[PDB]
Amino acid sequence: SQIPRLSAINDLHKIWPTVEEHGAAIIESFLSLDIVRRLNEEVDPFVKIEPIPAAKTKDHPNHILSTTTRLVNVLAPISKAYREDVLNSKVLHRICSDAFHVYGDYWVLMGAVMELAPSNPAQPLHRDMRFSHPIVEYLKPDAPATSINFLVALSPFTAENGATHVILGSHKWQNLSNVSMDATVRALMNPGDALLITDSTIHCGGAETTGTETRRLLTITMGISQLTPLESNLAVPRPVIESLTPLAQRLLGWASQRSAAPRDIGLLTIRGNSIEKTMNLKAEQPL
Amino acid sequence: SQIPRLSAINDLHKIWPTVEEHGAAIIESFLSLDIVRRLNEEVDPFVKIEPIPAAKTKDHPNHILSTTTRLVNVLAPISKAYREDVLNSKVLHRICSDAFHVYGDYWVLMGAVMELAPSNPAQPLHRDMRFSHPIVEYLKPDAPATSINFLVALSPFTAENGATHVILGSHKWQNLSNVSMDATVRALMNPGDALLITDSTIHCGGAETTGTETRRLLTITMGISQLTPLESNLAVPRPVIESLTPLAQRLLGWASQRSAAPRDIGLLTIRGNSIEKTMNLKAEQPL
Ligand SMILES: COc1ccc(/C=C2/C(=O)Nc3ccccc3C(=O)N2C)cc1
Ligand SMILES: COc1ccc(/C=C2/C(=O)Nc3ccccc3C(=O)N2C)cc1
Ligand SMILES: O=C(O)CCC(=O)C(=O)O
Ligand SMILES: O=C(O)CCC(=O)C(=O)O
Ligand code: NI
Ligand code: NI
Numbered sequence: 001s002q003i004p005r006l007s008a009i010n011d012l013h014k015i016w017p018t019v020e021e022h023g024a025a026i027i028e029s030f031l032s033l034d035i036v037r038r039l040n041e042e043v044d045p046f047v048k049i050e051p052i053p054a055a056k057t058k059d060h061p062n063h064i065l066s067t068t069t070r071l072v073n074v075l076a077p078i079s080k081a082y083r084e085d086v087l088n089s090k091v092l093h094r095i096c097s098d099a100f101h102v103y104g105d106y107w108v109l110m111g112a113v114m115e116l117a118p119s120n121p122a123q124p125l126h127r128d129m130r131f132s133h134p135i136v137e138y139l140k141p142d143a144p145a146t147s148i149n150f151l152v153a154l155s156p157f158t159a160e161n162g163a164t165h166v167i168l169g170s171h172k173w174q175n176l177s178n179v180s181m182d183a184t185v186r187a188l189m190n191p192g193d194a195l196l197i198t199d200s201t202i203h204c205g206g207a208e209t210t211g212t213e214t215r216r217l218l219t220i221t222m223g224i225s226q227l228t229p230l231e232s233n234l235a236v237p238r239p240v241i242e243s244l245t246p247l248a249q250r251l252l253g254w255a256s257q258r259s260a261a262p263r264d265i266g267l268l269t270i271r272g273n274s275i276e277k278t279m280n281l282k283a284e285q286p287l
Numbered sequence: 288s289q290i291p292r293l294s295a296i297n298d299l300h301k302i303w304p305t306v307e308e309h310g311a312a313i314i315e316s317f318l319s320l321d322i323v324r325r326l327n328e329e330v331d332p333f334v335k336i337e338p339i340p341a342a343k344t345k346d347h348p349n350h351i352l353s354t355t356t357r358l359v360n361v362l363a364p365i366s367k368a369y370r371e372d373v374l375n376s377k378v379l380h381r382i383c384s385d386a387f388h389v390y391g392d393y394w395v396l397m398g399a400v401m402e403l404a405p406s407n408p409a410q411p412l413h414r415d416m417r418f419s420h421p422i423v424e425y426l427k428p429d430a431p432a433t434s435i436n437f438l439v440a441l442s443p444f445t446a447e448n449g450a451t452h453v454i455l456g457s458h459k460w461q462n463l464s465n466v467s468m469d470a471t472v473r474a475l476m477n478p479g480d481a482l483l484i485t486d487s488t489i490h491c492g493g494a495e496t497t498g499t500e501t502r503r504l505l506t507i508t509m510g511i512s513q514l515t516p517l518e519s520n521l522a523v524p525r526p527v528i529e530s531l532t533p534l535a536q537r538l539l540g541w542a543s544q545r546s547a548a549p550r551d552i553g554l555l556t557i558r559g560n561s562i563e564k565t566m567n568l569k570a571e572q573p574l
Contacts, residue, residue: 050558058559060543063550074557103421131552134390135433135513143425226422228513228544232555234521235566256347257515263350265418268519270361271337272345279522
């Protein structure tokens, strides 16, 4: 059984139900090739200057990722395409509201460009969030997913160049005795296609076997506003924040958040008032 | 069986183990009377100007609290005593590190002064966090507490003036069929004493029966850094933040946070570096 493939345009309402059932779906043309081109051009130099994940200069080193991986997060100040087009994606917001309605508001836990160098080895089969959110392992087995990951192709994803592996149905597994690469299928994708998985989907980066190809992806971990993001937008200039839509501001934590509790008292509030009301935060003011 | 009473000075190591077992403990002299006096003087006018919890001017109204309740949160910009003495409390930090070591770093989910007017009615018996963090209800029954609440007396707590009710052992209850005021005992406290409960302890504010007395408390909900605070310090002037200790800065979300994962990749980071390193955030710079 291959990963279900759905149109971002025509199959929008089917995307979350498909992931809830199978643990994975390919969203064809999640981003237009124009958005992919602009995002690639904007992040290009930041990928080139990025040190190894566990660089000795870093006070929060990533000791997990391969030395042939470059990860660049906090994309809002880097990329106009990201903070305007991606953060306001109609498809992303329909899927996230479908997924997280039981919990309430959602925001970006991490938006990162990942670039894998030629001959990058396959990652071990894993669930996400286990190096940042221990709390997730204490959730009841059948608890609705508290985060999902859009793995957006910024270059071709082929079997040969290390396309992502997923185990379909593995998001519902309690016993992990049958976890093996034998159980996996591949996310073959054109640039702009996205693999959508949950925080419980067992998956891994594939082995780069050509020895010539550089694979790049945009990973958008969307999570309930009750969970702390892996990344901070606290240092993003206020002029950049005030250039965004109110919705994009909320996704970067520059707004108060609401739970789905019938008489919700809210998150990141200030004496009964929102961040945006208190700070008089402007929106859609061009730079 | 009455609520166990412990000295902040002499019984420090016994406090968290006592709450883990019984679901509640009284910390005698948690704050000195001097700190209580200074905090009361500093918040006094902010309590007086505070509207009803569900005021029509508020875009995050609290529809739960009685109209005879005034709640003032985001205390850092209001109170020197709070941001210096309370946020750096040796007793608070030992208890929180004892409670949350399985999860990692902790911070303030809410620090609020609550003032109850004369003849304030008893609250319904409840667990905290159910109007802000639906995720907590999806945790496995025996999951370690992800938040605890220091209910610090800023005035006398008597049976007559509505001292808090707790059900001892109720933090371990799955079946709530035996929940009744018949099962409760009272937190009788002098100013500076604190009632410590978990997010699972069944408790309620008591009925004010004198018709003359105003009861005031400082409620400090301490929670794992993986859960989003009820309140935001985003609007607190940077000069005020830079006057605090690095530890106080972390508690207000003006620092990156760490999980207890052996190879933790951190929370609120910026491309492998902390908020404080990135923003060049100064500490202990007097105003
Ligand atoms: C080589 O083996 C691995 C490498 C990574 C993971 C998983 C994570 C993670 O939990 N979260 C994310 C989410 C998006 C992108 C990257 C990461 C990441 O950095 N790590 C560490 C597991 C196994
Ligand atoms: C009248 O009945 C009530 C009133 C309050 C609660 C509980 C909460 C809550 O979950 N969190 C806190 C934590 C500290 C102080 C106040 C509150 C608060 O405002 N509410 C609503 C329950 C029942
Ligand atoms: O490289 C990939 O396709 C997946 C990367 C990943 O799953 C991860 O780093 O968590
Ligand atoms: O009034 C009290 O002592 C307790 C208040 C409380 O439990 C609450 O508001 O959540
Ligand atoms: Ni992963
Ligand atoms: Ni309460």
